[PDB]
Amino acid sequence: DPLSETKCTLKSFTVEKGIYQTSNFRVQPTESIVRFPNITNLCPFDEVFNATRFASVYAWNRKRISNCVADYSVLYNLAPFFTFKCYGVSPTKLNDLCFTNVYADSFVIRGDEVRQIAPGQTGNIADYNYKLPDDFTGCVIAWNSNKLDSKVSGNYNYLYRLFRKSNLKPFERDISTEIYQAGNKPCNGVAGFNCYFPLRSYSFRPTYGVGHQPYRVVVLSFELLHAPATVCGPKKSTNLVKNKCVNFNFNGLKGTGVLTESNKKFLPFQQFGRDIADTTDAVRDPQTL
Amino acid sequence: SNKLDSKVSGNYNYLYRLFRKSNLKPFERDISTEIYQAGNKPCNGVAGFNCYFPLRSYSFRPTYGVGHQPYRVVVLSFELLHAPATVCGPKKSTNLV
Amino acid sequence: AYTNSFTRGVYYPDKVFRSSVLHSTQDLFLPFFSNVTWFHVIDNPVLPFNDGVYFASIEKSNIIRGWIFGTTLDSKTQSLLIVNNATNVVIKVCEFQFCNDPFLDFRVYSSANNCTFEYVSQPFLKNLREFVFKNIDGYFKIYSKHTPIDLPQGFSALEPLVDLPIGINITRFQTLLALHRSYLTPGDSSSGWTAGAAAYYVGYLQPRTFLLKYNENGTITDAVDCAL
Ligand SMILES: *[C@@H]1O[C@H](CO)[C@@H](O)[C@H](O)[C@H]1NC(C)=O
Ligand SMILES: *[C@@H]1O[C@H](CO)[C@@H](O)[C@H](O)[C@H]1NC(C)=O
Ligand SMILES: *[C@@H]1O[C@H](CO)[C@@H](O)[C@H](O)[C@H]1NC(C)=O
Ligand SMILES: *[C@@H]1O[C@H](CO)[C@@H](O)[C@H](O)[C@H]1NC(C)=O
Numbered sequence: 239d240p241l242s243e244t245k246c247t248l249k250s251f252t253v254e255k256g257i258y259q260t261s262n263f264r265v266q267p268t269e270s271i272v273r274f275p276n277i278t279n280l281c282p283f284d285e286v287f288n289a290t291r292f293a294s295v296y297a298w299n300r301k302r303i304s305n306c307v308a309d310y311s312v313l314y315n316l317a318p319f320f321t322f323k324c325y326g327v328s329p330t331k332l333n334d335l336c337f338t339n340v341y342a343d344s345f346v347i348r349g350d351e352v353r354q355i356a357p358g359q360t361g362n363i364a365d366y367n368y369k370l371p372d373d374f375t376g377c378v379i380a381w382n383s384n385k386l387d388s389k390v391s392g393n394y395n396y397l398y399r400l401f402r403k404s405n406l407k408p409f410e411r412d413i414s415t416e417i418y419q420a421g422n423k424p425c426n427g428v429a430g431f432n433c434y435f436p437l438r439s440y441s442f443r444p445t446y447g448v449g450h451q452p453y454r455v456v457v458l459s460f461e462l463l464h465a466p467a468t469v470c471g472p473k474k475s476t477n478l479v480k481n482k483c484v485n486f487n488f489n490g491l492k493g494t495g496v497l498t499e500s501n502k503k504f505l506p507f508q509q510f511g512r513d514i515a516d517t518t519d520a521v522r523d524p525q526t527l
Numbered sequence: 528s529n530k531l532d533s534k535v536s537g538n539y540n541y542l543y544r545l546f547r548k549s550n551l552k553p554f555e556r557d558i559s560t561e562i563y564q565a566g567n568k569p570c571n572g573v574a575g576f577n578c579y580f581p582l583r584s585y586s587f588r589p590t591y592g593v594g595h596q597p598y599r600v601v602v603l604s605f606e607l608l609h610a611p612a613t614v615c616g617p618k619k620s621t622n623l624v
Numbered sequence: 625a626y627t628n629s630f631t632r633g634v635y636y637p638d639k640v641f642r643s644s645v646l647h648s649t650q651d652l653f654l655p656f657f658s659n660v661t662w663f664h665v666i667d668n669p670v671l672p673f674n675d676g677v678y679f680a681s682i683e684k685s686n687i688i689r690g691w692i693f694g695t696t697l698d699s700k701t702q703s704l705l706i707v708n709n710a711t712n713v714v715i716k717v718c719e720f721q722f723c724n725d726p727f728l729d730f731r732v733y734s735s736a737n738n739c740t741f742e743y744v745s746q747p748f749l750k751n752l753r754e755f756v757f758k759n760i761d762g763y764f765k766i767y768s769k770h771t772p773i774d775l776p777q778g779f780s781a782l783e784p785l786v787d788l789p790i791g792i793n794i795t796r797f798q799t800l801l802a803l804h805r806s807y808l809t810p811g812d813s814s815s816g817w818t819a820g821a822a823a824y825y826v827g828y829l830q831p832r833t834f835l836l837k838y839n840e841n842g843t844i845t846d847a848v849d850c851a852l
């Protein structure tokens with residue numbers, strides 16, 4: 239009770255006649271609201287995995303992302319989803335991380351050979367065709383779609399590479415037509431015995447197994463270069479309440495205070511207004527403006 | 528702890544958990560391990576439908592680099608307030624003056 | 625030739641609303657009564673981009689159509705190219721090799737390489753135009769103001785238009801011109817082609833303390849330089 243608190247603030251069991259400042263009343267906030275602008279520039283990964291055309295193993299493309307807002311939570315609506323072993327980063331916390339630029343690697347991989355593309359692995363296409371670094375940040379998107387992209391007359395248009403003598407370092411390509419050198423042999427220029435030219439092709443069939451199936455492998459990669467980040471992930475939910483002591487957070491600027499309608503005419507480039515002696519007076523809504 | 532605990536084709540008895548529903552309060556422990564998920568879909572989704580088993584087996588080999596060799600770490604917890612204490616060094620006493 | 629800039633070069637440094645208070649800002653502004661370089665369009669040399677350039681132009685036929693930025697004109701390092709048009713602007717930082725003279729709109733003077741960034745927005749364009757370019761914190765800022773009309777005595781605050789997240793090293797810059805029916809070669813002479821009679825201005829920013837007077841509606845009505 240305020241009598242014994244007055245005995246508490248002066249450290250004496252008996253108080254005399256007079257007015258005493260004991261404490262300071264302060265209203266605790268009830269709710270907390272965060273707001274962010276609209277998802278205008280949505281990310282065009284719909285060109286990547288929802289497309290029908292795809293590249294080969296050695297002829298993979300690299301499609302970069304400059305400025306977008308991301309959305310990976312809606313990407314899980316696909317039915318052949320079965321592999322998402324992410325590398326370094328948990329898939330839950332990636333939605334809040336904001337990076338600089340995103341590169342995608344789109345190709346098709348033999349479904350028995352999908353375990354070779356992993357950090358700390360050795361295999362056929364891993365050491366000779368395509369490898370990821372051990373400091374890689376990203377995941378693999380692999381799914382089977384043999385019901386749509388194949389026919390019984392032979393879907394051997396997707397080509398691949400089995401072997402070569404050297405080892406390709408990652409982040410380059412080769413469309414080089416190089417002759418096999420076994421030993422004491424000159425180059426002829428035409429195919430034949432011990433001139434094993436590596437132009438190969440797979441054996442895509444619609445009924446070709448359940449584990450030896452075409453897995454459309456998309457390896458999406460995230461890069462940082464100690465720069466100001468451009469590619470932002472899916473933002474938090476936006477909710478708004480007025481005339482109540484709530485926590486406000488409009489692109490930062492976290493605090494406690496009520497929100498009331500104003501009457502002034504602000505300039506369009508202003509984002510948050512500051513009163514005298516460095517106190518925030520007014521912040522405009524990033525959604526409804 | 529490379530020569531003692533790291534095994535070839537084994538060393539799977541030590542476990543580690545990848546996620547948790549909330550940040551655990553300090554000096555606490557948990558033993559039960561039911562499968563947790565995103566909430567709107569049931570458990571046993573270890574195939575990859577947005578569900579993970581928390582306790583994963585590492586099973587690494589000594590061919591790895593220095594960043595992921597198993598380090599047998601031991602933390603000592605102390606409290607240095609004024610209380611009746613009976614655990615300190617072998618420093619002898621001196622008769623009272 | 626030279627011209628003294630009387631009260632120009634004042635922009636919004638903090639993008640906040642302040643109603644009828646006076647703020648002492650310590651940033652980079654053009655000092656008052658300082659000289660700027662005066663040019664006449666009726667060939668341009670390269671000018672250094674030290675730590676910020678205030679650009680000014682009074683035109684009546686829209687003959688300048690952008691700028692070129694970058695620490696080098698060669699294709700070894702990433703340069704910047706901003707060209708304006710009748711409908712939109714394209715901001716393009718991707719390190720193309722440029723000629724010894726800028727192009728006159730032959731609608732191409734650039735080659736191919738690793739290309740990185742591209743930007744579409746609103747069009748940036750007697751008519752007076754002012755522009756300020758700054759790179760201190762790795763963010764490209766442009767403050768502009770178009771007032772109908774040497775340089776006038778009227779005060780005018782310059783509002784921020786765009787803010788790019790590119791942080792390219794900039795040391796040199798170069799202006800753009802445009803002329804009717806002009807063909808260009810990799811090797812250019814000093815003759816050129818005829819255009820409208822106009823002029824443009826180039827200033828330089830220095831770190832000065834400025835006390836800006838804000839109005840009731842948040843507009844800057846007057847400014848006072850400390851070391852003047
Ligand atoms: C991309 O695929 C997903 C999964 O089926 C689908 O929900 C989405 O609508 C597709 N996007 C398109 C067709 O633009
Ligand atoms: C965001 O979306 C809402 C609803 O579509 C709209 O009313 C509002 O004007 C939008 N804001 C911006 C800045 O586009
Ligand atoms: C006690 O158990 C609850 C429920 O599992 C847990 O949240 C809490 O952290 C535990 N506290 C301690 C001290 O172990
Ligand atoms: C092209 O630019 C990118 C990023 O600026 C760089 O990684 C790449 O090496 C460049 N290519 C060259 C210089 O051939």
Ligand SMILES: *[C@@H]1O[C@H](CO)[C@@H](O)[C@H](O)[C@H]1NC(C)=O
Pocket residue numbers: 695793794795
């Ligand atoms: C930027 O350019 C200047 C002048 O050419 C040079 O002194 C400086 O080292 C450059 N900085 C970087 C990061 O390249």
Ligand SMILES: *[C@@H]1O[C@H](CO)[C@@H](O)[C@H](O)[C@H]1NC(C)=O
Pocket residue numbers: 503839840841
């Ligand atoms: C501020 O704006 C209001 C609304 O347009 C106007 O009535 C008033 O005259 C302006 N005040 C000044 C000092 O410009």
